[PDB]
């Protein structure tokens, strides 16, 4: 049996999974969140991808598709056909709701770049059927990245919100197969979040589930989930100085007890101490 | 002592280290390529970063810095100092020689971005130093990211050639703490590299020596290099069969004896520790 | 996520034939191998037949080899089991199962298969 383990390696060198990222801060959500259904940066603790999470982050928050000046028309990112009707969006889709998108499209064969911005809340924006609206973006062949992101077109004047997920379907049909959503098994915890500083017109934190360094490590390692949580311990490589005992469950998520672990140094490592009840209360971060 | 590993996942499903691209094929360099320097995607095996490597992709192929609309004055990636006369650029900095680069550059607290054009032959161009040329780019702090290449500004009429690395120093000081250049060990053998398709005016293949997943995959394991050389195969995920044999030697590499018309879903799994001289059978036979 | 849906069984007489047939929806993209499993009255759940979804490979169990089938749609997302020649120890119920995490070659172990079927009887009589 392989035994379970979490990279050797600080979070301040790792990635976000949802934006190719660095990693800047660990952080709890605000107290209006008590559940997210974030599409990527989702995997087990046995290495099971789930909703359109890539293993590589050169798959992430990007797009892939033919513009006939109307919509474009997405495929897999490497070129693959999507098919409808049967997931949220391709491998690899950006998964941010609550903002406006700009992507950087480029073309292999043909110069230059070109900003598509994109709300995602029009029945035009229909990734779940393989389509979404073109918005000015000229008949091609392109492959985008996002780029930046601002406050969404509607409603009106609402502020970015990145807890969010966008609306895969429309009113023709809701989108299928999500991912499902995470919550906080245990007494007191709240869900962990990776945070990373996303370009745009404000302070945007954008929170992910898992570094992207985690999940290819897990997708690879696939070690057999023996118990109902994973007793972690947050470590100080300065010191050596267990700074929080965390638990991780087997959906892909941490959690702990708030004191607080917003305030918790970017240079740590996340250590598996034992396998240990899904009910095991932690102590606070810190206290 | 740990064994040695490399990740139990498929070469398709992996990341060029010298920018963020899917990996699509295997290549060998062609015959005018003897030796390469890459400064990205350099890893030993048991885990050693060197270059411009980083642990992960969000930080490949990135740049950052002030502009003062004369120069950009390079930082790190999180805005940590850059100090000249130290290493050949910043953690992450773009390698591709032999083209000019246009770099999507954005802003912490702006909207938009901008297109960044970055002739890398110029005497400007100095990001040993820590500065390169700002080429329009009006004042302020940007991050940026490699989008798209071209052919060379210069020499005038000359082809995207993504074997080379840029000019990181200048006329009055080279550039110190380069990676070293990994060369063909012999014996038949030639370099293995990993290829992504590039976005720009033409057919580019960007090669890389290790994806990126196998660096953070090393720098996370720290095995110890007990032998001189790491005998693979190739394994098909279909029927399990052996598809060649390789070697991986402790400055980061692998060889075969012949590649290019090898699958891409397969991996590569560690056989046993070889000799630096051990005789590989050629790639099928 | 992926879900599979069971279908075609039903009671059969020995030495008849019967095809079970089982849809696969969801993140089909990258599953790798696609099973049937049986479990019999009193018996543990055993593997029957697997095959690499995207590739040519398959493998059956001993004791249907020569009498079994699995196969895919050329058309549709979904997997077949060709029963011929059936005796009444094959009644069971068969499930079908996928694997999408990275593996190589048809695994036979349980609990290295990702996702299961509610699963479909096969009565045989004699």
């Known amino acids: 049996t392989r035994p379970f383990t979490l990279p050797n390696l600080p979070l301040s060198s790792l990635s976000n999974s949802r934006a190719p990222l660095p990693i800047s801060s660990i952080g709890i959500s605000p107290d209006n969140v008590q559940s997210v259904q974030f599409q990527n940066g989702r995997c087990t603790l046995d290495g099971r991808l789930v909703g359109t999470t890539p293993v590589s982050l050169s798959h992430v928050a990007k797009i892939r598709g033919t513009s006939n000046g109307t919509v474009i028309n997405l495929t897999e990112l490497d070129g693959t056909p999507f098919h409808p009707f049967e997931g949220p969006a391709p491998i690899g889709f950006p998964d941010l709701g609550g903002c406006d998108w700009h992507i950087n499209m480029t073309q292999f064969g043909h110069s230059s770049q070109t900003q598509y911005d994109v709300d995602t809340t029009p029945d035009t924006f229909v990734p779940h059927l393989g389509s979404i609206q073109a918005n000015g973006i000229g008949s091609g062949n392109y492959v985008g990245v996002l780029s930046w992101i601002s406050p969404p077109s509607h409603p009106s004047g609402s502020q970015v919100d990145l807890w969010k997920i966008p609306n895969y379907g429309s009113s023709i049909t809701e989108a299928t197969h999500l991912a499902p959503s995470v919550y906080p098994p245990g007494f007191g915890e709240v869900l962990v979040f990776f945070m990373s500083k996303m370009p745009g017109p404000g302070a945007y934190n954008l929170p992910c589930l898992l570094p992207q360094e985690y999940i290819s490590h897990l997708a690879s390692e696939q070690a057999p989930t023996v118990g109902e949580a994973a007793l972690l311990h947050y470590v100080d490589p300065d010191t050596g100085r267990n700074l929080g005992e965390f638990k991780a469950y087997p959906d892909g998520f941490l959690t702990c007890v708030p004191n607080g672990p917003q305030q918790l140094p970017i240079n740590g490592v996340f250590v598996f101490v034992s396998w240990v009840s899904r009910f095991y209360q932690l102590k606070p971060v810190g206290t | 002592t740990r064994p040695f590993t490399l990740p139990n996942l498929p070469l398709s499903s992996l990341s060029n280290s010298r920018a963020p691209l899917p990996i699509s094929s295997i290549g060998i360099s062609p015959d005018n390529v003897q030796s390469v320097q890459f400064q990205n995607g350099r890893c030993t095996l048991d885990g050693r970063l060197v270059g411009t490597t980083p642990v992960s992709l969000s930080h490949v192929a990135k740049i950052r810095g002030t502009s003062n609309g004369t120069v950009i004055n390079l930082t790190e990636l999180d805005g940590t100092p850059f100090h000249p006369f130290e290493g050949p650029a910043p953690i992450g900095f773009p390698d591709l020689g032999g083209c000019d680069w246009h770099i999507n550059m954005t802003q912490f607290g702006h909207s938009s971005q901008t297109q960044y054009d970055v002739d890398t032959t110029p005497d400007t161009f100095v990001p040993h130093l820590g500065s390169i040329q700002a080429n329009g780019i009006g004042s302020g702090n940007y991050v940026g990211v490699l989008s798209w290449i071209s052919p060379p500004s210069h020499p005038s009429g000359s082809q995207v050639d993504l074997w080379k690395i840029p000019n990181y120093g200048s006329s009055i000081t080279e550039a110190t703490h380069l990676a070293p250049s990994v060369y063909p060990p012999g014996f038949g053998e030639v370099l293995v590299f990993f290829m992504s398709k590039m976005p720009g005016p033409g057919a580019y293949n960007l090669p890389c020596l290790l994806p990126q997943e196998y660096i953070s995959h090393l720098a996370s394991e720290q095995a110890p290099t007990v032998g001189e050389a790491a005998l693979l195969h190739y394994v098909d995920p279909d029927t399990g069969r052996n598809l060649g044999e390789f070697k991986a030697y402790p400055d980061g590499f692998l060889t075969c004896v012949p590649p290019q018309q090898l699958p891409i879903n397969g991996v590569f799994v560690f056989v046993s520790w070889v000799s630096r001289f051990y005789q590989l059978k050629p790639v099928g036979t | 996520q992926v879900q599979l849906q069971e279908s075609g069984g039903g009671l059969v007489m020995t030495g008849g034939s019967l095809r079970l047939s089982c849809a696969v929806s969801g993140r089909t993209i990258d599953v790798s191998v696609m099973a049937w499993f049986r479990q019999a009255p009193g018996k543990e759940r055993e593997f029957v037949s697997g095959m690499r979804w995207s590739g040519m490979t398959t493998y059956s169990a001993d004791s249907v080899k020569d009498r079994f089938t699995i196969s895919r749609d050329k058309t549709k997302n979904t997997v077949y089991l060709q029963m011929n020649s059936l005796k009444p120890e094959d009644t069971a119920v068969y499930y079908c199962?996928?694997?999408?995490?990275?593996?190589?070659?048809?695994?036979?172990?349980?609990?290295?298969?990702?996702?299961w079927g509610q699963g479909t009887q096969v009565t045989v009589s004699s």
């Open positions: 199962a996928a694997r999408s995490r990275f593996i190589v070659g048809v695994p036979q172990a349980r609990d290295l298969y990702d996702y």
